[PDB]
Design an enzyme around this catalytic site. Structure first.
Site, mmCIF file in Angstrom:
data_model
loop_
_atom_site.group_PDB
_atom_site.id
_atom_site.type_symbol
_atom_site.label_atom_id
_atom_site.label_comp_id
_atom_site.label_asym_id
_atom_site.label_seq_id
_atom_site.Cartn_x
_atom_site.Cartn_y
_atom_site.Cartn_z
ATOM 1 N N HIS A 263 3.001 10.930 7.087
ATOM 2 C CA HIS A 263 2.372 10.571 8.351
ATOM 3 C C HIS A 263 3.394 9.951 9.281
ATOM 4 O O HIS A 263 3.900 8.875 9.004
ATOM 5 C CB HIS A 263 1.223 9.584 8.102
ATOM 6 N N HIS B 74 1.651 9.144 1.558
ATOM 7 C CA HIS B 74 0.639 8.984 0.529
ATOM 8 C C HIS B 74 0.984 9.947 -0.606
ATOM 9 O O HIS B 74 1.374 11.062 -0.320
ATOM 10 C CB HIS B 74 -0.758 9.276 1.060
ATOM 11 N N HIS C 273 5.217 6.897 7.040
ATOM 12 C CA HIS C 273 4.937 6.551 5.666
ATOM 13 C C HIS C 273 4.373 7.779 4.957
ATOM 14 O O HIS C 273 4.103 8.800 5.598
ATOM 15 C CB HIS C 273 3.971 5.364 5.594
ATOM 16 N N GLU D 245 -3.872 13.420 1.506
ATOM 17 C CA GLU D 245 -5.113 12.921 2.109
ATOM 18 C C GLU D 245 -5.922 14.086 2.646
ATOM 19 O O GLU D 245 -7.035 14.370 2.207
ATOM 20 C CB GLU D 245 -4.792 11.838 3.112
ATOM 21 N N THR E 37 -6.464 6.282 8.165
ATOM 22 C CA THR E 37 -6.963 6.512 6.834
ATOM 23 C C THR E 37 -6.912 5.307 5.914
ATOM 24 O O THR E 37 -7.289 5.393 4.751
ATOM 25 C CB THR E 37 -6.217 7.694 6.146
ATOM 26 N N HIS F 12 0.823 -1.192 0.000
ATOM 27 C CA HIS F 12 0.000 0.000 0.000
ATOM 28 C C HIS F 12 0.870 1.259 0.000
ATOM 29 O O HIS F 12 0.528 2.211 -0.707
ATOM 30 C CB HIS F 12 -0.946 0.013 1.212
HETATM 31 N N1 BE0 Z 1 -2.510 6.579 7.293
HETATM 32 S S1 BE0 Z 1 -2.507 6.664 8.898
HETATM 33 O O1 BE0 Z 1 -3.843 6.888 9.382
HETATM 34 O O2 BE0 Z 1 -1.470 7.514 9.416
HETATM 35 N N2 BE0 Z 1 -2.005 5.161 9.373
HETATM 36 C C1 BE0 Z 1 -1.759 5.082 10.859
HETATM 37 C C2 BE0 Z 1 -1.055 3.765 11.245
HETATM 38 C C3 BE0 Z 1 -1.924 2.578 10.758
HETATM 39 C C4 BE0 Z 1 -2.096 2.699 9.219
HETATM 40 C C5 BE0 Z 1 -2.852 4.037 8.900
HETATM 41 ZN ZN ZN Z 2 -1.078 7.533 6.362
#
Ligand code: BE0
Ligand code: ZN
Ligand code: BE0
Ligand code: HG
Length: 258
Positions: free
Chosen positions: A118, A95, A93, A105, A197, A63
């Site tokens: 994130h 997006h 990570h 996002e 998300t 992903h």
């Molecule tokens: N995209 S996010 O909400 O930061 N993330 C948090 C850790 C679990 C995967 C989703």
């Molecule tokens: Zn994220």
């Protein structure tokens, strides 16, 4: 079996069939309407304490890619701001889009950035990440927008290992990476209660979204776009457009630190 993803056949419009919380009351991301967000003088100063961070590994999970940290001690923590207590960094990570005009996002007055970082943290009062995601205040995610312009020097070590983790399930050693090199100058932010998300979309997150984007070069984001969603030996599906669109704000208020 099939699995959730970001394609036409398994993307965000489908997630609710296996993760019904997708239609919940505190889903993320959201559009940040800057004129409706209110300054909150009750917010305490935000404290990003990453000097002792220990990165370990980088993983293509099909992903995105995660840069993982040793979270067995308070080596990298987030405190202050809207947060009660101490939140420990576990991974970061991104997006990103197929084109520079989309990929984030969160949006800002409906503006989409090229990507979003994130930094994921869990509340140490719950002992581990898995327990933390059973709690309404289990996680804090620090979100940082990326725009395309000048290169981000602190990002380049991430960019240069991506060739070694092209496909789903590949990982590489990634020690001694300093995530402080990914921050903008200002820590001015918006905050609201939301969710993961990605599936399982659990409503456990205090979001802290920095106002100031970082700049990355076109060449850096182009290398993100060479990753694959697929596994080795499978037909190539470029890892692009791995973002969830904005969700209904419902009964929430976004607060500004500034
Ligand atoms: N995209 S996010 O909400 O930061 N993330 C948090 C850790 C679990 C995967 C989703
Ligand atoms: Zn994220
Ligand atoms: N509901 S989901 O998890 O996004 N997915 C949709 C495609 C078929 C497998 C399940
Ligand atoms: Hg929760």
């Amino acid at each position: 079996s099939h699995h959730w993803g970001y394609g036409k056949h398994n993307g965000p419009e489908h997630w609710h069939k296996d993760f019904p919380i997708a239609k919940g009351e505190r889903q993320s991301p959201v559009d940040i309407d800057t004129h409706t967000a209110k300054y909150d003088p009750s917010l305490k100063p935000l404290s990003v304490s990453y000097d002792q961070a220990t990165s370990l590994r980088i993983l293509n999970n099909g992903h995105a890619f995660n840069v993982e940290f040793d979270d067995s001690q308070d080596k990298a923590v987030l405190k202050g701001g809207p947060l009660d207590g101490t939140y420990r960094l576990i991974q970061f990570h991104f997006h990103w889009g197929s084109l520079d005009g989309q990929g984030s996002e969160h949006t800002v007055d409906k503006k989409k950035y090229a990507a979003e970082l994130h930094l994921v943290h869990w509340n140490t009062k719950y002992g581990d990440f898995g327990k933390a995601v059973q709690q309404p205040d289990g996680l804090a995610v620090l979100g940082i927008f990326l725009k395309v312009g000048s290169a981000k020097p602190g990002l380049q070590k991430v960019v240069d290992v991506l060739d070694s983790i092209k496909t789903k399930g590949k990982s590489a050693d990634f020690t001694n990476f300093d995530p402080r090199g990914l921050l903008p100058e200002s820590l001015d932010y918006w905050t609201y209660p939301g969710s993961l998300t990605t599936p399982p979309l659990l409503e456990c997150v205090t979001w802290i979204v920095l106002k100031e984007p970082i700049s990355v070069s076109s060449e850096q984001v182009l290398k993100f776009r060479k990753l694959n969603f697929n596994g080795e030996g499978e037909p190539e599906e470029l890892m692009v457009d791995n973002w969830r669109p904005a969700q209904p704000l419902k009964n929430r208020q976004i607060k500004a630190s500034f």
